[PDB]
Amino acid sequence: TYKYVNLREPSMDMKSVTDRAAQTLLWTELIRGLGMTLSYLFREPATINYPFEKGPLSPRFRGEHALRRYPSGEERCIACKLCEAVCPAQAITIEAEPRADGSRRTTRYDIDMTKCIYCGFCQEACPVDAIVEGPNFEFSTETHEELLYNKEKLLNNGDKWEAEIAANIQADYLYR
Amino acid sequence: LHHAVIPHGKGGRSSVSGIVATVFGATGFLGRYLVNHLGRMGSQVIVPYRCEPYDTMHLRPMGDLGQIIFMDWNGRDKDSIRRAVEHSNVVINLVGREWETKNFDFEDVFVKIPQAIAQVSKEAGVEKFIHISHLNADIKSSSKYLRNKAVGEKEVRETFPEATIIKPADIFGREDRFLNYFANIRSLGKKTVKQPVYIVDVTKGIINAIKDPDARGKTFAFVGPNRYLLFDLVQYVFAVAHRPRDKVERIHTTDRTLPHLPGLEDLGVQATPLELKAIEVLRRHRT
Amino acid sequence: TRPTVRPRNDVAHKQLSAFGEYVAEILPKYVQQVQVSCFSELEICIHPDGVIPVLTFLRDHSNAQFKSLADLTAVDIPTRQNRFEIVYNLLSLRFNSRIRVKTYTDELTPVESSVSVYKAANWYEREIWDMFGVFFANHPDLRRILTDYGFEGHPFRKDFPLSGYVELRYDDEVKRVVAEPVELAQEFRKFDLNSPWEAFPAYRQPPE
Amino acid sequence: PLTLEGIKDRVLYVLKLYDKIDPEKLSVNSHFMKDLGLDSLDQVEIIMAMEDEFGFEIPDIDAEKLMCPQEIVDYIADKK
Amino acid sequence: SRGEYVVAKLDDLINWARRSSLWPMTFGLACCAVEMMHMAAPRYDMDRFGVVFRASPRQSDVMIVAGTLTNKMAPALRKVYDQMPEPRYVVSMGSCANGGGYYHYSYSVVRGCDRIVPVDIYVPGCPPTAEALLYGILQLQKKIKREKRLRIWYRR
Amino acid sequence: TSVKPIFSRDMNEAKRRVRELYRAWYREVPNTVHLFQLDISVKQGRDKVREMFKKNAHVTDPRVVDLLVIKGKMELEETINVWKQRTHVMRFFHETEAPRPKDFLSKFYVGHDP
Ligand SMILES: NC(=O)C1=CN([C@@H]2O[C@H](COP(=O)(O)OP(=O)(O)OC[C@H]3O[C@@H](n4cnc5c(N)ncnc54)[C@H](OP(=O)(O)O)[C@@H]3O)[C@@H](O)[C@H]2O)C=CC1
Ligand code: SF4
Ligand code: SF4
Ligand code: SF4
Secondary structure, eight states, X not given: OOOOOOOOOOOOSHHXXXXXXXXXXXXXXXXXHHHHHHHHHTSOOOOOOTTTSOOOOOTTOOOSOEEOBOTTOSBSOOOOOHHHHHOXXXXXXXXXXXXXXXXXXOSEEEXXXXXXXXXXXHHHHOSSOOEEOOSOOXXXXXXXXXXXXXXXXXXXXXXXXXXXXXXXXXXXXXXX | OOTTSSOOSSOSSXXXXXXXXXXXXXXXSHHHHHHHHHHHHTOEEEEEEOSOHHHHHHTGGGSSXXXXXXXXXXXXXXXXXXXXXXXXXXXXXXXXXXXXXXXOOSTTTTXXXXXXXXXXXXXXXXOOOEEEOOTTOXXXXXXXXXXXXXXXXHHHHHSSSSOEEEEOOSEESTTOSHHHHHHSOOOOOOOOEEOOEEHHHHHHHHHHHHHSTTOXXXXXXXXXXXXXXXXXXXXXXXXXXXXXXXXXXXXXXXXXXXXXXOOGGGTOOOOOOHHHHHXXXXXXXXX | OOTTSOXXXXXXXXXXXXHHHHHHHHOTTTEEEEEEOTTOOEEEEEOTTOXXXXXXXXXXXXXXXXXXXXXXXXXXXXXXXXXXXXXXXXXXXXXXXXXXXXXXXXXXXXXXXXXXXOTTHHHHHHHHHHHTOOOBSSOSOXXXXXXXXXXXXXXXXXXXXXXXXXXXXXXXXXXXXXXXXXXXSSOOOOOOOOOOSOSOSTTOOOOO | OOOHHHXXXXXXXXXXXXXXXXXXOOOTXXXXXXXXXXXXXXXXXXXXXXXXXXXXXXXXXXXXXXOSHHHHHHHHHHHO | OHHHXXXXXXXXXXXXXXXXXXXXXXXXXXXXHHHHXXXXXXXXXXXXXXXXXXXXXXXXXXXXXXXXXXXXXXXXXXXXXXXXXXXXXXXXXXXXTTTOGGGOXXXXXXXXXXXXXXXXXXXXXXXXXXXXXXXXXXXXXHHHHSOOHHHHHHOO | OOOOOSSOSSHXXXXXXXXXXXXXXXXXXXXXXXXXXXXXXXXXXXXXXXXXHHXXXXXXXXXXXXXXXXXXXXXXXXXXXXOSOHHHHHHHSOOSOOOOOOOHHHHHHSOXXX
């Protein structure tokens, strides 16, 4: 099935040819374009006042790279290296050790914010939902040193909020 | 000494080299080239500035990721200077404006600045402190510049005696002062014999001396390869450039060699002549 | 077997089998393999001398029109003396079918520069010359396109590693950008993922 | 004013003008390649240097067949 | 100290004059350029901040390096950087541009634009969301608010 | 054993094409060092050119010589145009060290480079 274009002829009848001559010598559809643009002038423009009104989103945005923890409990991560096994720019760096207790844990959990393409594979790959892509996207960092997260920065960034992260997950733990 | 100060592997781009250098100045000319050659070596440079961060911003990306570090200093307090030289392998002193200001003379920058930094350095325990000086800065006349530099020379020689007191001749390069004044002319004609030394041999000598131990205590002086008349050099500048009071007195004052102290030959670096680099740098003429 | 497993048509398989047998019979001078996969896309595997005659046949003849030219690449296979595989891909405007003309070649002897009959092959051949080094005699212009000019090494080979040998940085010494031997900031770790235990029993090669 | 001896004198002082030849040591049977310790690289240097000096293009096989000062002078005397 | 008073007030006026409009040039190699054109979109404005998108390099206040810097790109990028007035500022947008990123382990790619030009404001993301980029330009403006050039000139 | 060479029959045509290519590089150098507003004497550039020629003089296989001639012709085209910038032309040179000598003891101080 096909529906092509540009198959006509200029009509040799006197009315159509004098109408094309009237458009040629009278600048008509140009003024029709001016009328359409003035109709968009008299609309109200759709802008948002940026520092006061922030643009809408989804409950599943991928931002901050925050961590979670157990209810009144310890660190949610096990250092099971799945996120570094899936990290498609290898920005995760995990060096693991157990502590004096016996449960297996970490030493070094580094996210490179340069290499992080923000897939979501480390969120989907985490069996205990330790790393969660965060809600807010404001990094804006004046120095390149400061864009290399440490595990303690991630724990502070996961302890500046969980209630946002918990609300988003508790809303959408059923799709994924 | 602790690890991560020992050298590691090859050189360049965050290969962990030897020295950790606290640099005073480095926003000017020779300090900027010196930070450049230490970044080629791959050495961490701690530099404090006092000015706007835009100047240290356009000399910022010389190093690799997070190698060089920026902080603040002032010419009044020992606390900020001491905080800047808390942990340093080597430290170099390069400072000086060639005209008096409202708040600083030729006195007390060249005098008062090496006093406090050498005080907190010797109380701090730094090694291989390299202090620059102008060549032939005497007790003799014609320059508050040169006599305050001679007082600073006697200070750095007396307290902390194993400092490398270093002196080049009047250096020329991409952002020279006196060749710029040769361009920024009008005139007058005098006589003075003079040897010019190019800047990259000077800073290569400084980085080689600061990375090579056992060459300490001795003051050094750098030698120009030609050593001829100033007015013939001005004719050479106008010929290659296609067009026909303190600075002019301090270039007409004194230019000699000293047989006492050792120079280039105890370091093993090739000398670049005036002619090659002068043809390289004399751009910006008529077409 | 029927849900969530893609069914096929044996009719197209028989059609491509008969067609490939026909082409193999009527150009015997260069035909070595005519192989048909399970999902009916034809492959014809060719000595590197009948490039121009086979493509002049396959552009025409009113039984195999195949005007549409596609990919050219020469898949770098070691453990061979003829390493590189020039893969012509041809699509028929009239018959809606895909044939893969795989001709084989070595490192240094040219195949015969298909741009004479295929005007789409010009930058394809220039790309293969830039990335591999397969020379193309009787060609108008061979240059380096999709690489840097001062860079060399023919990087899509297997001998060229992942990172380049050279790495640029600006320096204020000579006031310009220079190349240096590569100083990585991290390792590019290497996961030994080639697990044992023979996931496909049908594709077993006979061992020694 | 275009004789054999004027061409030989100008070939003589441009052989003086070439740098790596030590000394000139001109002869009609000199053979500066092996008797004076020179390279075929320096041979083609001198051949296209004479080309740069005073005239015609001197193509590749005739550039190969010379290997000798007086034979260069006689080849120019043939060609010019 | 009305000399210091006039210095502080005049510095406030000139730096507010600098940070007021700040028309950039959009260098924009890869898909980060598409997200910059999406903060040129009618929703996320740029008129409100005096920010006029303009391809002119001769009058560029700030420069938004975005996309993926390559070895073939870099000398032409710094030649664009040179013919530019000396009051200038750099926003490195994109994971590709602020440290190599997803193409970090590769050939032909400079490991971030730090190795060519200095960077004032890094804004990460892939793509850095137009909302987040506009936040990064606001924190650039606050960096312009803290510059103290005339203070340093007076007490120099 | 059938091998189809590029251009060669013996090394005579190899010598002929490489000496003509060197003539082209000789008349290529001063125009480029004047055009790109470079900073290097003509003697040094020509000596580094002939040093790069004298690096690969150890090859007798004629196909390899043909492919070297074709590569040198490619870069002579791309430098006789204005397609290559100042950066690549300086990248042929080595004015930024790279200081590494071949002494044993020098490699023994800055170690693990046998
Ligand atoms: N031919 C020559 O020029 C020669 C020069 N020298 C010496 O080399 C040194 C460097 O020379 P050059 O680069 O040309 O000059 P500069 O003035 O540029 O170098 C001095 C550095 O220290 C800073 N500085 C100077 N005075 C003060 C001050 N009162 N308070 C704070 N910072 C100060 C300068 O500016 P800022 O504060 O902005 O950082 C700059 O960073 C000088 O000491 C000079 O005497 C020696 C031999 C030859
Ligand atoms: S996948 Fe989750 S639990 Fe496992 S190492 Fe990564 S963050 Fe920790
Ligand atoms: S979202 Fe970032 S940290 Fe997570 S897998 Fe992707 S690149 Fe790695
Ligand atoms: S960071 Fe992402 S959006 Fe930006 S250029 Fe790279 S791939 Fe494109």
